[PDB]
Amino acid sequence: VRPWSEFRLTPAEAAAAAALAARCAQRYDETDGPEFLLDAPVIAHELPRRLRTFMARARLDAWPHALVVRGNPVDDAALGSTPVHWRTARTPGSRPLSFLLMLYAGLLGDVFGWATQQDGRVVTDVLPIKGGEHTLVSSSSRQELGWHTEDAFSPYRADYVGLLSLRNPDGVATTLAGVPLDDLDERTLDVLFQERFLIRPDDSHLQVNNSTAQQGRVEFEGIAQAADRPEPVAILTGHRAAPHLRVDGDFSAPAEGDEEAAAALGTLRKLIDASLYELVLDQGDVAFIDNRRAVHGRRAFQPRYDGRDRWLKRINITRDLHRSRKAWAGDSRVLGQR
Amino acid sequence: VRPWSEFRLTPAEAAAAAALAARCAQRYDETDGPEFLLDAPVIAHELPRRLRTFMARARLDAWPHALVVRGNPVDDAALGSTPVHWRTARTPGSRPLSFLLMLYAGLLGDVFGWATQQDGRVVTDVLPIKGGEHTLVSSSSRQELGWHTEDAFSPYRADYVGLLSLRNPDGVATTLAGVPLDDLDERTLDVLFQERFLIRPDDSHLQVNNSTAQQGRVEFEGIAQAADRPEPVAILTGHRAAPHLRVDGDFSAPAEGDEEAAAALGTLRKLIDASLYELVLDQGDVAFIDNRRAVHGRRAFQPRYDGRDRWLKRINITRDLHRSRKAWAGDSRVLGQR
Ligand SMILES: NC(=[NH2+])NCCC[C@H](N)C(=O)O
Ligand SMILES: NC(=[NH2+])NCCC[C@H](N)C(=O)O
Ligand SMILES: O=C(O)CCC(=O)C(=O)O
Ligand SMILES: O=C(O)CCC(=O)C(=O)O
Ligand SMILES: [Fe+2]
Ligand SMILES: [Fe+2]
């Protein structure tokens, strides 16, 4: 069995999808422009029908932790070297694949970015940054990226996180875990459903991990409020037989002095640690991780820094953009508050 | 200006959409079968491109209370007489248009029904029922159907309510109103955002307005719990500059003894009453009402009972089916709890 839903493109289907993305790259200036943001969901209707059927059906299944699409061709010579930083990572060689990721994402929902993450970009980059090996952000390497709900601190966090592997020569594993419902006793479950936990914003939302500019500066103040004064929230929500999950192994805490909540979180930690499994995104594989059913991370790896490091394109997806309307900057798709 | 977003099909576009719906009616046994429920969203990708662009873009706009599509051809001779009851309302003449409504709905989200409403049907019927002129349900006529959020009692209520006019010879108006934000003072607004109100299920969820059978019987018990023991909820949620609305003019009440909450609800009533406007769905018009931004109703009218009464097909749409997973019966798209 597999805890995720998987689809493998035929070479013909993969070529057709690539051709469509290349056409988009020819017609539009960038992926994050207002034009392509609006058009991509409709252009995505031209993708191979079997893939559209998979994405429409698999999203509605009750069980999978992710939707995985294998077999998108990538030519390393055409792609070029892995960027040394996300700032300069919008290379011409990676451009068609960025368009491709957004097309696939459009079949699942409304894409968006954060003003406080990688300069408000919608399509972001995951790659190892020299000197940042032992950090809590996606550009880490030597230190394992601990399991987490994406942007757990925020009520506007994605429903799906898309990851497209541009290259991964050494097969470094993405980690995943669902709610450990087979082992959570009812008392512990009861406590996890109560608003007795604190969840602060991760380090990617700090100014230090963004470019030196006034572009999207006011949104960093809302990150500070979330870090300094986190209101108590629940870890589990919804149906007790299939709960949605909101937790971060490195940024979650119990409400101050609440030892019963602490015990529940401690138990949850051990159960997620013990059930954590691996998904290897080989070059050309795309995963859309269900950010409500599963937490995810990335195994520790030794970075190369020789031009062929592991490199993913990444995108946040929500089923309903209007859920985050308080955090809207304007007509843009870049979220944040004060 | 218009408070809703409007689209008029060209005759060619309308004919193409009709042709697609007719093809679906030929290929599938019914609209509510598991097959067409799953396929309709992908088949909808074959609708006229200008319409798909409208639906993709208009849904993301911040302002409209509804998305209105004009100009679907309807032949009264082909359609046949208006049914005397919803039970027998799945007539061959109305079948293609039911498929059409579901195709359009598939562009906006996941369709669903309620076990306690019209025998769990996904595509439901709005028509006057003889002897039921002065009721609080959609089959009323002589008594105005007061403004309401659809299924306000439930946290699984639709994001969009679709209404397709099969006929409306006397131009009876659907009523609509947004949040009266131009007139709500901040104190009143503050109170409406607090969990100080009760909202009970409407009369369409009662057993008396469903067929005599054991089909979907356990779900009526959850309706009783909502009616007997309503937990306090808010009327307004989300962004204060653009709140989402949850209210029913005939089923909302303040929390017991809460006079400040009562004052706020009383004020809201008068402001919605005063700002209520009309939308006439002529034969062939389809409206997708934003059930979070607007309340809606229907003007009082004199029923004919001569075979040509006003008749709509209706459908509930959610942006995320998994929001209601506690209320899932099984793999079906019919909601309810105990
Ligand atoms: N436990 C954690 N490391 N949480 C933060 C995860 C990494 C973060 N989502 C980023 O893009 O950098
Ligand atoms: N205030 C009201 N009348 N609320 C109930 C509205 C009618 C209900 N949605 C039905 O289908 O019959
Ligand atoms: O590198 C990976 O596979 C996971 C990256 C990740 O968790 C993130 O960017 O949020
Ligand atoms: O008849 C109309 O136009 C409105 C019907 C309605 O409000 C409903 O069926 O929920
Ligand atoms: Fe992540
Ligand atoms: Fe209604």
Swiss-Prot record, chains A, B:
The keyword Iron applies. The keyword Manganese does not apply. It is a single-pass membrane protein. Fe cation binds at residues 148, 150, 296. GO terms for cellular component: membrane. Keywords: Antibiotic biosynthesis, Iron, Membrane, Metal-binding, Oxidoreductase, Transmembrane, Transmembrane helix. Pathway: Antibiotic biosynthesis. Its EC number is 1.14.11.41. GO terms for biological process: antibiotic biosynthetic process. It is found in: Membrane. Its cofactor is Fe cation. Pfam families: TauD. SUPFAM superfamilies: Clavaminate synthase-like. The chain crosses the membrane at residues 97-115. 2-oxoglutarate binds at residues 174, 310, 314. It comes from the Bacteria. It catalyses: L-arginine + 2-oxoglutarate + O2 = (2S,3S)-hydroxyarginine + succinate + CO2. GO terms for molecular function: 2-oxoglutarate, L-arginine oxygenase (succinate-forming) activity; 2-oxoglutarate-dependent dioxygenase activity; iron ion binding. L-arginine binds at residues 136-138, 248-250, 314. Belongs to the clavaminate synthase family. Involved in the biosynthesis of capreomycidine, an unusual amino acid used by non-ribosomal peptide synthases (NRPS) to make the tuberactinomycin class of peptide antibiotics such as viomycin and capreomycin. Catalyzes the stereospecific hydroxylation of the C3 of (2S)-arginine to generate (3S)-hydroxy-(2S)-arginine. Usually clavaminic acid synthase-like oxygenases catalyze the formation of threo diastereomers, however VioC produces the erythro diastereomer of beta-carbon-hydroxylated L-arginine. NCBIfam families: GntD_guanitoxin, viomycin_VioC. This is Alpha-ketoglutarate-dependent L-arginine hydroxylase. It comes from Streptomyces vinaceus.
